[PDB]
Amino acid sequence: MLEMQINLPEVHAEVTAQFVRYEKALTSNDTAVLNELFWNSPQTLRYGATENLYGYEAIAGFRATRSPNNLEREIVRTVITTYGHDFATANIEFRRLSHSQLTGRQSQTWMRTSQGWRVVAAHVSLIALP
Amino acid sequence: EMQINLPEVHAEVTAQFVRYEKALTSNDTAVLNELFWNSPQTLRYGATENLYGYEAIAGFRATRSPNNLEREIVRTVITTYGHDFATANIEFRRLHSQLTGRQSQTWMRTSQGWRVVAAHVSLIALPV
């Protein structure tokens, strides 16, 4: 039963390590790693801060041309949850070292594929902090 | 090796997603709460607030306004993984301003049925 298999420590460790790689790649604009970690499927999607992208080829195309400026941020809060052995969500709140009056949220859903853990869908947005 | 969009699973999840959307438009708070995973781990990144845990999400729904306006759906992507997991992602326009809404959910099949384990909604300005 899946609800007796929330945050199994070995699975949670695995997902957390890949999430850490993703965050480091994001801040250094390591596009190879950012693409590696997204599920290579037409179903994968990314709702970015400024665009909606459908399918791995569109997301990888977008990362190729995106500017490496104003990427740095501090993570304020993190919740990674795993379900059984093969599925997880990763959610963070962040603040960009630049833009002062907004707080950022990033959400991912991760799946264990035959090539390792991959992001199947993601969503990033910034909202006004009261 | 998770099987994608198995037909029974994909139909089931789609039917619960439709229940959720109809409850949003009618402000049927009981159904909106029923469909969220009853766990401290559940979270909801709303258009204007971040809520952590079922009790906070349910409290927020119960006390908010009958405001949630109708949407025109631009695109819907519902994907299932094996028998017990899914994602539901929609792009929408509120029938209001010129913003483009995005709503993302992840669903799990619990012992009480399909539930939302995490969700995120945001509105952005896209060029026309």
Numbering used by the authors:
A (entry chain B): 1 to 130
B (entry chain A): 3 to 97, 99 to 131
Copy out sentences from the published article reporting this entry, exactly as the authors wrote them:
AtzH is the first DUF3225 family protein that has been shown to possess a catabolic function, likely decarboxylating the product of AtzEG-mediated deamination of 1-carboxybiuret as part of the cyanuric acid mineralization pathway. Size exclusion chromatography performed on AtzH after removal of the his-tag, suggested that the native protein had a molecular mass of ~ 29 kDa, consistent with a dimer (2 x 14,655 kDa).
We obtained the X-ray crystal structure of the AtzH. Differential Scanning Fluorimetry (DSF) was used to estimate the stability of the protein and showed that the native protein had a Tm of 57.2°C. Well diffracting crystals of AtzH grew readily, and two different space groups were observed: P1 and C2221. X-ray diffraction data were collected for both. Analysis with PISA gives an interfacial surface area of almost 3,200 Å2 (or about 29% of the total surface area of the protein). The AtzH active site was sought by examining the X-ray structure. However, an in silico docking simulation between the X-ray crystal structure of the AtzH dimer and 1,3-dicarboxyurea elucidated a potential active site.
